[PDB]
């Protein structure tokens, strides 16, 4: 029996994305953040292409397809970055891209050292919890459906159904080589805790990028078009409490 759902997730997983950063130049806040912004813009393109190819994504009202991407991109990208950091450099550095790897010096120069260490901790968890490539893929897909508005989506019912199905698929992946319901329960606990841990990090970054956008002109940090639009229109809805993450635990 072929794992249809997993086959799809592996097939649509985005390839390597480079930031275009000039690593020959001495590190500077403006250059580092401008490169992170450009990487965000480039990754956003891949996230949209990826999301549109996810099982059942098209069932969502188009307005909701837009919304979920606009609200969840930070978490999605941070989670994937954590996985790359673990797989490529054993969490020794933050692997934003092959050409944008953060050592402690860069974490400090970026002025978001605190957020960086939390992301490095997330990276370490992938190793400590022995997260499998398949669990990573399913969890990442679930992160796309983990933040919603209080006024509700155009069609909240279709979103709820899709989210439920992805949680169900995560269950199946957990039960794969586990014939003991208790072991499955313990694994589900671990993974939902990991998923929840992404949200506080994403919130800190949402706050940081929002503040940076507002003062970008005086710190020489460039924001690409899509990033600037999303950070000035959607991110504030998250920061003002109109859009909130769905936490498994309280």
């Amino acid at each position: 029996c072929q794992p249809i759902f997993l086959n799809v997730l592996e097939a649509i997983e985005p390839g390597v994305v480079c930031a275009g950063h000039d690593n020959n130049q001495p590190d500077s806040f403006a250059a580092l953040l401008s490169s992170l912004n450009e990487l965000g813009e480039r990754q956003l393109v891949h996230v949209v292409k990826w999301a549109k190819a996810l099982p059942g994504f098209r069932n969502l009202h188009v307005d909701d397809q837009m919304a979920v991407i606009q609200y969840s991109w930070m978490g999605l990208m941070v989670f994937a970055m954590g996985w790359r950091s673990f797989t490529n450099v054993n969490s020794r550095m933050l692997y934003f891209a092959p050409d944008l790897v953060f050592n402690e010096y860069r974490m400090h120069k970026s002025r978001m050292y605190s957020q960086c260490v939390r992301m490095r901790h997330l990276s370490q968890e992938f190793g400590w919890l022995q997260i499998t490539p398949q669990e990573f893929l399913c969890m990442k897909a679930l992160l796309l459906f983990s933040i919603i508005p209080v006024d509700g989506l155009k069609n909240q019912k279709f979103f709820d159904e899709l989210r439920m199905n992805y949680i169900k698929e995560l269950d199946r992946i957990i039960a794969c080589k586990r014939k003991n319901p208790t072991s499955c329960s313990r694994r589900f606990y671990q993974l939902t805790k990991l998923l929840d841990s992404v949200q506080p990090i994403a919130r800190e970054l949402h706050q940081f990028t929002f503040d940076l956008l507002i003062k970008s002109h005086m710190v020489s940090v460039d924001f690409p078009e899509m990033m600037a639009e999303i950070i000035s229109v959607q991110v504030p809805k998250i920061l003002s409490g109109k859009v909130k993450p769905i936490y498994f635990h309280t």
Binding site: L44, V48, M66, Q70, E225
Partner: peptide
């Protein structure tokens, strides 16, 4: 926006 165009 460019995102909307990308999505559609």
């Amino acid at each position: 926006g460019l995102l909307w165009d990308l999505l559609t």
